[PDB]
Amino acid sequence: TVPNTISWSPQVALIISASSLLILLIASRSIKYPQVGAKLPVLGSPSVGTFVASMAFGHVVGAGIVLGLSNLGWL
Amino acid sequence: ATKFPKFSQDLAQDPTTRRIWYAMATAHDFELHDGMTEENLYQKIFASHFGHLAIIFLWASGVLFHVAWQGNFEQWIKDPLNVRPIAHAIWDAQFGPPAIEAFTRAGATNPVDICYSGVYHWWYTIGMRTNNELYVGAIFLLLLAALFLFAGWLHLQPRYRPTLGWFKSAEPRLNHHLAGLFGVSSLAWAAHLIHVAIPESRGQHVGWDNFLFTPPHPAGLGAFFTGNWSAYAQNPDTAQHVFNSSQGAGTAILTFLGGFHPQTQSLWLTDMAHHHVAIAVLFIIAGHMYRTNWGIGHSIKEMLNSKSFFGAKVEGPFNLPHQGLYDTINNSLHFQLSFALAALGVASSLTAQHMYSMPPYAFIGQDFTTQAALYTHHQYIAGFLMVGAFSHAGIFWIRDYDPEQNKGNVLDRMLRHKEAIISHLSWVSLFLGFHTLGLYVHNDVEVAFGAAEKQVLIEPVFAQFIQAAHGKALYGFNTLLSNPDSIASTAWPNHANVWLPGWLDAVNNTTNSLFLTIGPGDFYVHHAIALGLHVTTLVLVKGALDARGSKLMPDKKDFGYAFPCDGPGRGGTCDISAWDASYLAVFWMLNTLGWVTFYWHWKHLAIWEGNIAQFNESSTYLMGWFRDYLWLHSAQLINGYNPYGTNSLAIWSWMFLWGHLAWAVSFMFLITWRGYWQELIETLVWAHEKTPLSFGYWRDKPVALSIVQARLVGLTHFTVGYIATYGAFLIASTAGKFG
Amino acid sequence: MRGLEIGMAHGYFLVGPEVVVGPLRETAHGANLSGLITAIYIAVSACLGISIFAITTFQGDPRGAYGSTSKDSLRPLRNRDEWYQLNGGIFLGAMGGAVFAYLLLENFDALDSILRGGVNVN
Amino acid sequence: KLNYRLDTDPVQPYKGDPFNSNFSTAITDSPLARAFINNLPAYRKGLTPFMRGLEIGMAHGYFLVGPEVVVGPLRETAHGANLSGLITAIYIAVSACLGISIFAITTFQGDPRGAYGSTSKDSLRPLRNRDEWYQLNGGIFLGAMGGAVFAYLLLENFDALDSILRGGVNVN
Amino acid sequence: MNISDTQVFVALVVALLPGLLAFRLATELYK
Amino acid sequence: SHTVKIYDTCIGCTQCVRACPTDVLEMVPWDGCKAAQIASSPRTEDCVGCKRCETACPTDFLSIRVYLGAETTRSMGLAY
Amino acid sequence: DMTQLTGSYAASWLPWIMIPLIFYILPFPVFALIFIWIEKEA
Ligand code: F6C
Ligand code: F6C
Ligand code: CLA
Ligand code: CLA
Ligand code: CLA
Ligand SMILES: CC1=C(/C=C/C(C)=C/C=C/C(C)=C/C=C/C=C(C)/C=C/C=C(C)/C=C/C2=C(C)CCCC2(C)C)C(C)(C)CCC1
Ligand SMILES: CC1=C(/C=C/C(C)=C/C=C/C(C)=C/C=C/C=C(C)/C=C/C=C(C)/C=C/C2=C(C)CCCC2(C)C)C(C)(C)CCC1
Ligand SMILES: CC1=C(C/C=C(\C)CCC[C@H](C)CCC[C@H](C)CCCC(C)C)C(=O)c2ccccc2C1=O
Ligand SMILES: [Ca+2]
Ligand SMILES: [Ca+2]
C-alpha cells in the first residue's frame, strides 16, 4: 500500500517550526565553527551561515518527522 | 614456590596440597590479596559483576534455546492444562530400552525431561507464541551477554577504569538506580505488556514487524496527553474471555479489576500493566530525592549527622544518634553486601509467599509440581541469602568497623547491649522450643493411647481474624472486608473500592490458594517456624556481635573472620570464630526451611488430593507428619525402579538415594576430625614410599584437610544431600501422583 | 625399552575384562571391540598422566624423591628425557598389546581350530 | 616536530628488535598465541624428539584417513572406502617420513647451511641435531601409522560404535 | 515446529563471540 | 611461619618456654616484672602452632600469643 | 523405535557427538591443563 500522507494542518507547522527551533539552539552551541561570516538573545548569537544551516536542517529533519509519523499513524 | 595462586605468596610457598584447596577458597576474597588497594579492589569487583551478569544472560539464553530446540512450546500452547512442558532432551548413552521408553513421553519421540521451572507459563503470559520467537530471544541474550563481557573488559582498561570517588558517590548511584534501573525498567515492562502481551492474549499478533503502526488502544496516545485516562480502563476483558483468543476479549489496557482471570485462574494482564505503570511512576519520583549536581536534593550524610528537629535539640532521627554512619556504610563493602543480601532474601521469601496464592502466569496454578518447585526454590534461596547477610555483617564487624568513628551512635549501643540481645533471643528460642515440642509430644502420646480428643488444639484465632479482615467469610467473623457494611468495605468517602468485587471473589473461592483455611495444625507449625527463625537469628546474631571478641577470646578480631580455634587451653575453644557461627546457622536454616517446605507441601498435597481432612487431623502430632506425609507419599518415589521394571520416576528414585548418600558422607566430615586422618595419611605416605614399581611421587605433600576446610566440606555435602533428597521427593510425590 | 615391555604386558591383559563381563558381551565382535577400546582409553589416560607428571615434576630441582640429593632406589628415572622415552614406549607397547589381544580374540574360532588340529582336515 | 609515537603503538617491533623482519602482533606475540604455539608438540619445552614426532604423527595420521572415505572413489561401499582412506594415509605418511629422512641426510653434512647452522638463531627451528631429526622421524612414522589405524578401526566399526553411542547395546 | 538445522548452526556460531569475550575478560581479570 | 608475640604483662614464670615442644621460646633478662625476665621467640620458624605456651601461660589475659600464618613443612609437623 | 537414543529435533547427531566430547573426551585434557597451570614453578 502507499504510505499515508496527511493534508497540511497547523500540527505539521508545529513540527517543522519546533524542529527548526530546537536545531537552532543546539547548532549554535555544538557545531565547531559558528559565528563565521556575517552576523544576523537567548541564542548563542549565530551567524548567517549557522542560521540558514539550522533552518535548512530543520526543514530536512522536520519533513522526515512529518512523513514518518503520518506513515505510522503518529508512530 | 609456585605461580599459583597469583594473589597470595603465603599460599604459593605452601608445599602441601592445602595450597591448592585454599587457593580456591580465597580467590574471590579480593581484600586479602597481596598488594591490594581500595581502587583496584573496586575495579576488580566491577568487572566481576559484569562477568556475573553475562553469566546470568547466558543461562537465560540457554534455557530459551533448549526450549525452542527440543521442547514442545507450540504444542503446549494449544492445551496448557494437559500437555507436559519439556525442559530438554535426554542423551545418556548408557540407558536401557526400558529407560528410553519410560522417559519418552509428553508427545515426544525421544527421551525428554519435564520442565518444572514454569518458564512455559511465563513466556505464554508475556505474549510469546512460537519457537522462532524463543530462538530470537536466545540469540538476543547471547548478544547481550557478549556486550556485557565486552563492557567488563573495557572498564578494566586504563582509560576506562573508574576512580575510587566514582565508586564512592552514593547519591547519584541511588538516584539512577531508583529512577532508571527500577523505574524506567518497570515502565518499559509495562510498555511491553500493553503493546505486546495484552494484544497477544487477545488473539492479535504484535511483533517487531508491525508494532510501530499497531496502536495498543483505539483512543491512542491522545487520551493520555489530554487527561482522558479513564478511556484506557473502558471495556475490560469479560468473565467469559478465552486466553489467546478474541472471544470475550476487551479493549482496555489499564484496568484494576483485581482477583483472577476466570479461565487462567491468574492475575489480569491489564492489572499487571497498570501495576508496573504505577511502580514506574513511584520509583521515578523516588529517584529525585538525593542531591547530585544541582543543589536540590537531600544529602544522606547531613540527614544522618543532623541533631536539630526544627529548632529543638535531638540526638538524631527518632532521638537516636545516627552520626558517622554515612562513612561507615560508604567505606564498608561488607555492610552494603549485608543489606543487599538481606533485602534479596526478604524479596525471595515474598516472591515465594505471593506467587502460589496469587499466580501471575496463566494456568501455572494448576501445575502442582511447578508450584511446589518454585515455592521451595525461592524459600531455600531466601534462607541462604539471610545466612549470607548475617555472615557478612559479622565480616563487617571484624574488618570494617572501628569504634572511634562510631562512638556514641546506634551501632555502638547495639554492640554495648549485645549481651541483653543474645540472652533475650535465647529466652525466646527456649520458650518456643519447649512449649511447641511439649505440645507436639503430648498430642502424640494422646493419639497413641486412643485419646485424640485429649489433644491440646489451640486455634489460630489471630490469623483467622486477619483472614476475615481480608474478606474470608468462612470463619463467621464480620469485621472489615468480610462485613459488607464495614467502613473499610464501603470506603464511604469515595467508594473507589474497584478491587473489592474481584478480590472478594478470589478470596472466597474454594479452589485456589488465596488465604487457605487454617486450624490447630497450622498454628503449631507456624510456632515451629517461629522457633526455627528465632534460633537461626540467635546463632547468626551471636556470631556477628561476638565476632570482635568475647570473655573466652577477648582478642578475636585480631585472628580474622575464619580460623579453626584457639587451642585446647582455657577449657577448649572449638568452633569459636564467627565463621563457625555461620557454619552452625546453616544447619538451623536448613532445618527451618525444611519445616516450612514440609508444611507447604503437605498442606497443598492434601488440598490437591481432596483429602484436606487428613492434614487437618494428622498435622497436630508429629507421628502424623512422619506417617501420612513422608512414609505415605514415599511409595511412588521409591517404586520408580524395582525388580519388576522402571518408569519415569527412576531418575528421582536414584537421586533420592544420591542425596541420602551425600548427606551420609557429610557426617564423616563433621564427626571425625583432622588428626586421625593426618596420622592415616602419614601411614599411607610410608606405604607409598616403600612400594616398588610406584614411580609416581607427590609434588604437593599430601595432608589432611584443615579444620575449617573440613567444616566447610561437611556443610557442603550436608546441604547438597538435603537439597537433592528433598527435591527428588517433592518432584516424585507431586508429578508421579498428578499431571 | 622398559616402557615398551611394560606397555605390551599391560595393554595385553587390559582387554579381557570388558570382553568377558562388559555390556557388549552378548556378541563376540562387539565385546572384543569394547575391550580393545577400554584398553586404548585406559592406556591413553595413563600416558597423558605420565606426560603431565614429567611436565610438572622436572622444573628446576624436582621436589621430593626426584631431587638431585634424593637417594630413592625404588625411583631411578631421575631425568625428564628418560620419563618421555618411557612414556613413548609405554604408549606404543600398550597399543601393540591391546591390538594383539584383540586380534587373538577376534580370531578365537580360528585359533581354537588351530590349537585342536582342526585345520588339518583339509 | 617529529613524533613517531612508538611508545603508544599497538604494533611493536618483534622482541624489541626493529630490524629482524618481524612484528609483535596478536598472531605472533599475544599471550594466547604464544601459549598455544609454544606448547604444541613441535615446540613444547623438555619433550624428547621421539615424543614430539609421536604426538604429531598420531594427530595427522588420524585425520588423513577421512578425505578418501567420504569423497574417494571407493565411497560407494563402507569397507572399501575405509580401506582406501587407510591406504592413502599410509602412503602420504610414508612419503613424508622418506622426505624427513633425506632432509636429515642432506642438511646435516659438516656445518649445515641456512637456518640449521651452528651460528643460526632461528627460534622457530629448534631441532639443531641430526640425531634429533631421526628420533623425530621414528615418532612421526609410528604415530602416523597408529593414528591412521585408529581412525580405520573406528570407521570399520561405525555400526557397532553408533549402537554404542546410542545405547543400543543395552537391549540384551 | 521447532528450529531447523540452520538455526542451530547459526546459534552455535553466534555463541563464539560471547565465548571469546569471556576468555578476554577472564584473562584481563587474572592480571 | 607462625607468629609468636610476647606482651608486657609477662611475669617471667618460664612456663611457656618449658611447655614448647620445638624450642621456640627462651627467657631473656628484663626489668618489667619481679622475676626480672621475659619470654622471647627467636625461633618462630620452628613453631608448629600447638599453642601449648598459651595453655601454660597463667596471666589474664595471655602474655604470649600465637597467630597462625603461612604453612611450611616444619610448621605442619611433617616428617615426610 | 525406543531401543536406542534418537532425536526428532534438528541435528540430532549433535548430542551424539557432544556428550562424549564434554563428558569423557575433553575433561581429561582440561584436567591436565589445569594441573599444569597450578603446578608451575615461580
Ligand atoms: C601418581 C601416581 C601414584 C602411584 C604410582 O605411581 C600410586 C601407587 C600406589 C601403590 C603404592 C599403593 C597400591 C595401589 C592401590 O591398590 O591403591 C591405589 C589405587 C589407585 C588406582 C591409585 C592410582 C594409581 C595412579 C594414580 C594411576 C594414574 C593413572 C591415571 C589414569 C591418570 C589419569 C590422568 C588424567 C589427566 C585424569 C597405593 C595406595 C594408595 N594410594 Mg596411591 N599412587 C599414586 C597416586 C595417588 C593419589 C594421587 C592419591 C590420592 C587420591 C592416592 C591415594 C592412595 C591411597 C588412599 C592408597 C592406598 O591405600 C594404597 C596403599 O598404600 O596400599 C598399601 N594415590 N598407591
Ligand atoms: C576382570 C578380570 C579379568 C577378565 C574377565 O573375566 C579377563 C578375561 C580374559 C579373557 C578375555 C582372555 C581369555 C580368553 C579365553 O579363554 O580364550 C582365549 C585365549 C587364548 C586365545 C590364548 C591362546 C594362547 C595364548 C596366545 C598364549 C598366551 C601368550 C602369553 C601372554 C605370552 C607370555 C609371554 C611371557 C612368557 C610372559 C584372557 C587372557 C589373559 N589374561 Mg585375563 N582377564 C582378567 C584379568 C586378568 C589379570 C588380572 C591378569 C594378570 C595381569 C590377566 C592375564 C591374562 C593373560 C596373560 C591372558 C591371555 O593370554 C588371555 C588372552 O587374552 O587370550 C588372547 N587377566 N583374559
Ligand atoms: C552477592 C552475594 C555474595 C557475594 C558477592 C559474596 C562475597 C564474598 N563472600 Mg559471601 N556469602 C553469600 C553471598 C555472597 N558472598 C551467601 C549467600 C552466604 C551464605 C551461604 C555467604 C557466606 C560467606 C562466608 C561464610 C564467607 C563469605 C566470604 C566472602 C568473601 C570471599 C569469598 C570467598 O571465600 O572466596 C570464594 C569462595 C568460594 C568460591 C567458595 C567455594 C564454593 C562453595 C564451597 C560452594 C560449594 C559449591 C557448590 C557445590 C556448587 C555451587 C555452584 C558452582 C558453580 C560453584 C567475598 C567478599 C568469606 C570471607 O569474606 O572470608 C572472610 C567467608 O568466610 N561468604
Ligand atoms: C533433633 C535435633 C535437635 C534438637 C532437639 C535441638 C535442640 C536445641 N538446639 Mg540445636 N542443633 C542441632 C540439633 C538439634 N538441636 C544440630 C544438628 C545443630 C547443628 C550443629 C544444632 C545447632 C544449634 C545451635 C548453634 C544452637 C542450638 C540451640 C538449640 C536449643 C534451642 C531450642 C530450644 O531451646 O528448644 C527447647 C529445648 C529443647 C527442645 C531441647 C529438648 C529438651 C528435652 C526434650 C527436655 C526433656 C527433659 C527430660 C527430663 C530429660 C530426660 C532425662 C535425661 C537427661 C536422661 C535446643 C536445646 C540454640 C540454643 O542453645 O539456644 C538456647 C543454639 O544456639 N542448636
Ligand atoms: C548456560 C546455558 C546452557 C546450559 C546450562 C545448557 C545445557 C545443556 N546443553 Mg546447551 N546450549 C546453550 C546453552 C546452554 N545449554 C546455547 C546457548 C547453545 C547454542 C550455542 C547450546 C547448544 C547445545 C547443543 C548443540 C547441545 C547442547 C546440549 C546440552 C546438554 C548437555 C551439555 C552439552 O553438551 O553442552 C553443549 C553446549 C554447547 C555446544 C554450547 C554451550 C554454550 C553456552 C552458552 C556456554 C555456557 C557457559 C556457562 C555460562 C559458563 C559456566 C561457568 C561456570 C562457573 C559454571 C545440557 C542440558 C547437548 C544436548 O542437547 O544433549 C542432549 C547438545 O548436543 N547445547
Ligand atoms: C608373578 C607371578 C605370576 C604372575 C604372572 C603374571 C601376572 C603374568 C602376566 C602376563 C601377561 C599379562 C603377559 C602379556 C604379554 C603380552 C605380550 C607378549 C604382547 C605382545 C604384543 C605384540 C606382539 C604386539 C604386536 C603389535 C604391535 C606392536 C603393533 C602392530 C600390531 C601388533 C599386534 C602386531 C604367577 C601368579 C603366574 C605365578 C607366581 C609369580
Ligand atoms: C586450533 C583450534 C581448533 C582446531 C583443532 C584441531 C585442528 C583439532 C584436531 C584434532 C585431531 C585431528 C585429533 C586427532 C587425535 C588422534 C588420536 C587421539 C589418535 C590416537 C591413536 C591411537 C590411540 C592409536 C593406537 C594404535 C597404535 C599406536 C598402534 C596399534 C594400533 C592402534 C590403533 C591401537 C578449533 C578449530 C577446533 C577451535 C579453535 C582452536
Ligand atoms: C574423610 C576426611 C578426610 C580425608 C579426606 C581427604 C584428605 C580429601 C581427599 C580428596 C580426594 C583426594 C579427591 C576428592 C575430590 C572430590 C570428590 C571432588 C573435588 C572437587 C574440586 C576438585 C573441584 C580429612 O582429611 C578430614 C580432615 C578433617 C576432618 C574430617 C576429615 C574427613 O572426614
Ligand atoms: Ca590344512
Ligand atoms: Ca548388552
* Residues whose CB falls within 8 Å of the CB of residue B241, separated by 6 or more in sequence, listed in order: B247, B248, B249, B250, B261, B262, B263
H helices within B27-130, ranges in order?
38-70, 73-78, 97-103, 119-125
| Residue ranges near ligand 10 (ion) with Cβ within 5 Å | C 23; D 169
- Residue A2 is classified by DSSP as P
Binding-site annotation, residues of F for [4Fe-4S] cluster = 10, 13, 16, 20, 47, 50, 53, 57
What would the DSSP string read from start to end of B681-728? HHHHHHHHHT-TT-----SSB--PPPHHHHHHHHHHHHHHHHHHHHHH
Check pocket membership of D149 for ligand 7, CB cut-off 6 A: yes
**CA-proximal residue: ligand 3, atom 22 (nearest):** B388
Q: How far apart are CA B283 and CA B278, in angstroms?
A: 9
Which residue reads 538435603 in cell numbers? B722
What is the rounded radius of gyration, in angstroms, for the C-alpha atoms of chain F? 13
Please check whether residue F76 touches B, CB under 8 A: yes
Residue indicated by cell numbers 580393545 = C36
B195: which residues sit within 8 A by CB, 6+ positions away? B206, B211, B216
What is the rounded (10 degree) CA torsion for B115, B121, B126, B129? 70
Residue B457 cell numbers, joined: 488444639
Cell numbers standing for residue B625: 507428619
Cis previous bond, F61, omega within 30: yes
- Dihedral (C-alpha) B483, B488, B494, B498: value to the nearest 10 degrees? -70
Cβ < 6 Å from ligand 2: which residues? C 13, 16-17, 19-21, 101, 104-105, 108, 111
d(CA B675, CA B678): 5
Q: Output the nine-digit C-alpha cell for B98.
A: 526400558
Which residue bears the cell 508427545? B107
Please write down the long-range contacts of A67-75, taking CB distance under 8 Å and 24 or more positions apart.
Answer: A67/A3, A67/A5, A69/A15, A70/A3, A70/A4, A70/A5, A70/A6, A71/A3, A71/A4, A71/B213, A72/B212, A72/B213, A73/A4, A73/B213, A73/B215, A74/B220, A74/B221, A75/B212
In the DSSP assignment, the letter for residue B230 is G
Cell numbers representing residue F66 in the block: 600465637
| Amino acid letter, D124 | L
Q: Cα dist. B169→B30, B402, B674, D16, D171 in Å?
A: 21, 22, 47, 43, 67
Using the Cα atoms of residue C47, residue C48, residue C50 and residue C54 in order, give the sign of their dihedral.
Answer: positive
Nearest to A66 by CA among A14, A25, A12, A18: A12
All three cell numbers of D168, joined, read: 543400543
Q: What is the CA radius of gyration of chain C?
A: 19
Which cell numbers in the block locate residue B408?
556514641
Report helix, strand or coil for B88. Answer: strand
- What distance in Å separates the CA atoms of residue D114 and residue D101, rounded to the nearest whole number? 18
- Cis ω for the linkage preceding B5 (within 30 of 0): yes
CB B731 within 8 A of CB B110: no
Spatial contact of F13 and F45, defined as CB atoms under 8 Å apart: no
d(CA B79, CA B70): 18
Asked whether the beta carbons of B305 and B323 are under 8 A apart, the reply is: yes
Distance CA D69, CA D65 (A): 7
Q: What span, in angstroms and rounded, lies between the C-alpha atoms of E12 and D171? A: 34
Q: How far apart are alpha carbons B112 and B102 in whole angstroms?
A: 10
Write out chain C residues lying below 8 Å of D163, CB-based: 30
Q: Which three cell numbers stand for residue B273?
A: 500493566
What is the whole-number distance in angstroms between the Cα of residue C122 and the centre of ligand 9? 5
Ligand 1 atom with least separation from CA of B695: 6
CA of B729 to the centre of ligand 4 (A): 27
Residue E4, classed as helix, strand or coil, is coil
* Cα separation, B25 vs B555, whole angstroms: 25
Distance CA(D136)–CA(B473), nearest Å, equals 90
Round the CA-based radius of gyration of chain D to a whole number and report it: 23
Which residue's entry shows cell 486477619?
Answer: B466
Ligand 7 atom nearest to D58, measured from its CA: 19
Integer Rg of chain G from CA: 17
Tell me the three-class secondary structure of B356-376, residue by residue: HHCCCCCCHHHCHHHHHHHHH
**Secondary structure class of F23 (helix, strand, coil):** coil
Q: Which of C48, C50, C66 is nearest to C58 (CA)?
A: C66
Helix or strand holding residue B312 (H, E):
strand B312-313
CA B351 – CA B354 distance, rounded (Å): 5
CA–CA distance, B272 with B257 (Å, rounded to integer): 10
- Count each helix (H run) and each strand (E run) in chain G, helices first: 2, 0
**Buried/exposed code over B223-250 (b: 16+ C-beta within 10 A; e: otherwise):** beeeeeeebbbbebbeeebbbbeeeebb
User: What value, to the nearest 5°, has the Cα angle with vertex C74 and ends C71 and C80?
Assistant: 75
Q: Which three cell numbers stand for residue B570?
A: 582455657
Residue B225 to residue B638: CA distance in whole angstroms: 64
Contact D165 G16 (CB under 8 A): yes
Write out the three cell numbers for F79.
616428617
Query: Cβ distance D66 to D151 under 8 Å?
Result: yes
Q: Is D149 one of the annotated binding-site residues?
A: no
CA of B440, nearest ligand number: 4
Contact state of E29 with B135 under an 8 Å Cβ cutoff: no
Q: Is the CB of G16 under 6 A from ligand 1?
A: no
- Subunits with 3+ Cβ pairs within 8 Å of B are A, C, D, E, F, G
Closest CA to B234 of B206, B261, B270, B200: B270
**Residue B92, CB half-sphere, CA atoms under 13 Å: how many?**
14
Question: For ligand 1, is residue B696 a contact (CB within 6 Å)?
Answer: yes
Residue B224 and residue B221: Cα distance in Å, rounded?
Answer: 5
Going from the C-alpha of B366 to that of each of B258, B372, B416, B648, E28, the distances in angstroms are 19, 11, 52, 21, 48
Q: Which three cell numbers stand for residue B36?
A: 591490594
Q: Within 10 A of B639 (CB to CB), how many other CB atoms are there?
A: 17
Cα(B704)–Cα(B710) distance, integer angstroms = 9
From CA B283, how far away is CA B297, in angstroms rounded? 16
What's the Cα-to-Cα distance from B561 to each of B214, B556, B586, B589, rounded to whole Å? 60, 9, 16, 20
Crossing angle (nearest 10°) for helices E16-30 and D31-38: 100
C99, C100, C102, best to mutate for ligand 7 pocket (most atoms within 8 Å of CB) = C99
Breaks (C-N over 2.5 A) in chain G follow: none
Q: Residue A48 and residue B242: Cα distance in Å, rounded?
A: 64
Question: Mapping DSSP to helix (H, G, I), strand (E, B) and coil, where does residue B592 land?
Answer: helix
At residue F10's C-alpha, the angle toward residues F4 and F14, to 5°, is: 80
Which residue numbers in chain F precede an interruption (C–N > 2.5 Å)? Answer: none
- Cα–Cα distance, F15 to F34 (Å, whole number): 15
Instruction: Report the distance separating Cα B524 and Cα B502, nearest Å.
Output: 32
Distance CA G17, CA G15 (A): 5
Locus of grid cell 533428597: B725
Give yes or no for residue C100 CB within 6 A of ligand 6.
Answer: yes
Spatial separation of the C-alpha atoms in residues A26 and F55, rounded to whole Å: 79
D60 is in an annotated binding site: yes
d(CA B377, CA B354): 14
Cα gap A15→A63, rounded to integer Å: 9
Q: Does D10 touch chain E (CB under 8 A)?
A: no
Contacts of F53 (CB under 8 A, 6+ apart): F4, F16, F17, F19, F20, F24, F25, F39, F64, F66
Find the distance separating the first CA and the last CA of chain F, reported in whole Å: 18
Q: Which residue of B has its CA nearest to A74?
A: B213
Give the H or E element holding residue B308. Answer: strand B308-309
Question: CA gyration radius for chain B?
Answer: 29
Residue C8 makes CB contacts below 8 A (sequence gap 6+) with C93, C94, C96, C97, C100
CB C64 within 8 A of CB C78: no
Residue D4, H or E segment? none
Query: B424 phi and psi, to 5 degrees?
Result: -70, -35
The answer to whether A74 is annotated as binding is no
User: Which phi and psi angles does B33 have, rounded to 5°?
Assistant: -65, 150
Burial A31-65 (b: 16+ CB within 10 A, else e): eeebeeeeeeeebbebbeebbebbeebbeebbeeb
CA end-to-end span of chain D: 85
Question: Whats the size of chain D, residue-wise?
Answer: 172
C-alpha span between C2 and C17 (Å, rounded): 25
User: How far is C-alpha B79 from the geometric centre of its chain's CA atoms?
Assistant: 30
| Euclidean distance between CA atoms D38 and C55, whole angstroms | 14
| Distances in whole angstroms, Cα of residue B400 to Cα of each of B109, B301, B335, B394, B578 | 59, 18, 8, 10, 15
* Ligand 1 site, residue C20, Cβ cutoff 6 A: no
Report the Cα G17 to chain-centroid distance in Å: 8
Which cell numbers hold the place of A17?
A: 517550526
Query: Grid cell 598488594 — which residue?
Result: B35
| Secondary structure (3-state) at F27 | strand
Breaks (C-N over 2.5 A) in chain D follow: none
What 3-state DSSP class applies to B516? Answer: coil
B106-127 burial: b if 16+ Cβ within 10 Å, else e: bebebbbbbbbebbbbebbbbb
Q: Is B536 helix (H, G, I), strand (E, B) or coil?
A: helix
Residue B9 Cα to chain centre, angstroms: 37
Distance from CA of D59 to the nearest CA of G (A): 15
